[PDB]
């Protein structure tokens, strides 16, 4: 487009809800769990009752594919092009695109597997710095290749990640956090703090098998002014991320399950009390897993009908 600026906002986006509903439809039509426990609890006069919907649960292959959203006739989607984008505010170079770029709808807490990268440098996005309750999204500029697999106790899986590349990536991350925090403060990394098992650990899906990998060996450095192995444990009792309720799955597939992936992003949370600052990994809300890649798209409706005053005739 021409010399035009547009007020972009990603924390009040509408395409994130369409993504979220479409992907809940995909998981409710694809993965059939064995036993579901959804608290119904329909009425200080409240009464809580739980359903026991049981279905046959076979094993199915599962790997993500790219998805391109496109606007219908009469609507267009605008794409921002600023490399150092704050996430909100004015984008001063916007283009009109027909269909958005390729997105892989992956489930991931504590990390952003298989995502899309940044252009120039590692970028930091948030709803509000110094709010202590909003998830900080970090997008990398180089992918950290992680191999993460179950060798031929069936529930034992190792997960190798390179050490020097992760140290350089964390150095880039702490250098970028030092812009917002006075350039002289000590930054610390902890493992987690309580919660359910799919938030305190890196929880994802690989080959149709659920993975709950500990991340205490990755966030352990404190910054001032050869290969890490992670003990992944395959679980069967899970909490669904669709709604509130527990789920039963099958025993895992006999054989070898292999999947390599590119770590491209991160979800952090500040622990600010009353000095040094401690960033601990978080996640769990999958709208944060799609606001970090649909961060530069905005749907808009053309209205090709205007009025203007002239010196015209009858």
């Amino acid at each position: 487009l021409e010399n035009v600026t547009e007020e972009f906002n990603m924390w009040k986006n509408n395409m994130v809800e369409q993504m979220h509903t479409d992907i809940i439809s995909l998981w409710d039509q694809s993965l059939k769990p064995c036993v579901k426990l959804t608290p119904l609890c329909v009425t200080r006069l409240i009464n809580c009752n739980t359903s026991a919907i049981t279905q046959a649960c076979p094993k199915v292959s599962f790997e993500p594919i790219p998805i391109h959203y496109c606007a219908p006739a009469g609507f267009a989607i605008l794409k921002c092009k600023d490399k150092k984008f704050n996430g909100t505010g004015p984008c001063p170079s916007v283009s009109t695109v027909q269909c958005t770029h390729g997105i892989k709808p992956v489930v991931s807490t504590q990390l952003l597997l298989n995502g899309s990268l940044a252009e120039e440098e590692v970028m930091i996005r948030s709803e509000n710095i110094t709010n202590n309750a909003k998830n900080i999204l970090v997008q990398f500029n180089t992918p950290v290749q992680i191999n993460c697999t179950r060798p031929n106790d069936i529930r034992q899986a190792h997960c190798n990640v390179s050490k020097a590349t992760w140290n350089e990536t964390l150095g880039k991350v702490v250098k970028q956090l030092r812009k917002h925090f006075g350039n002289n403060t000590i930054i610390r990394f902890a493992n987690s703090s309580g919660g359910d098992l799919e938030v305190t650990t890196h929880s994802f899906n690989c080959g149709g098998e659920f993975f709950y990998c500990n991340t205490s060996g990755l966030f352990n450095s404190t910054w001032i002014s050869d290969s890490i192995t992670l003990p992944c444990r395959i679980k069967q009792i899970i909490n669904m991320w669709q709604r509130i309720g527990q789920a039963m799955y099958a025993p895992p597939i006999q054989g070898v399950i292999r999947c390599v992936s590119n770590i491209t992003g991160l979800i952090l949370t500040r622990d600010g009390g009353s000095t040094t600052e401690t960033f601990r990994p978080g996640g769990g809300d999958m709208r944060d897993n799609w606001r970090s890649e649909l961060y530069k798209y905005k749907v808009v409706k053309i209205e090709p009908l205007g009025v203007a005053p002239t010196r015209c005739k009858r």
Partner: antibody
Amino acid sequence: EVQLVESGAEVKKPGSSVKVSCKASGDTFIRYSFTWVRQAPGQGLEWMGRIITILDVAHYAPHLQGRVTITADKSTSTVYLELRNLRSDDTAVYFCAGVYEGEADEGEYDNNGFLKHWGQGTLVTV
Amino acid sequence: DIVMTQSPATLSVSPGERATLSCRASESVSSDLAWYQQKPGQAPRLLIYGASTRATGVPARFSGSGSGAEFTLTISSLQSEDFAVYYCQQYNNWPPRYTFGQGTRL
């Protein structure tokens, strides 16, 4: 390993409700899945019900569906059977039984259908 | 809807003789089969779970094998304490409709 103790023998008139208790001891109670099984005198074994403890979910056979409720008490670590509308076929011996499946606290589960640990048997006459 | 009948209903062999007890199904139940023995006046005891794996505290002469709707349990050296009634139970289906064998006498 655990040990299972059943209740005493009971004589019930038809049309009543019979309540059978089975107490397990030796390990943590919720790390097991239990099963109530019937044996008529001189006949073979008949599967009746299976309860999963950490979900408190009970599945039953379609032979007598709608006639039993199998409950679990994690406080007393006991599994309970309730048969209402009993008729003369169930003059038999009931067995409670349990099977291990791993670390059910953290999320591990195995769908074990075999029956390893057994009780001693409760005789009932209709 | 599962039906369960096995064809060697009654068997009688001399002690010290290898014996085969067969387990028949109407369709393939894969490998989810359990072999049990029961002395009269006592609770049943597990011998084989998974149709090819031995249990804990069992004699090594028991050997289960087969697949689909075809299973055989063989015993090598018959002893005096093995005079019991034997059962095979399948647990292949979810949601669980389970049933036992009718019970063969040694």
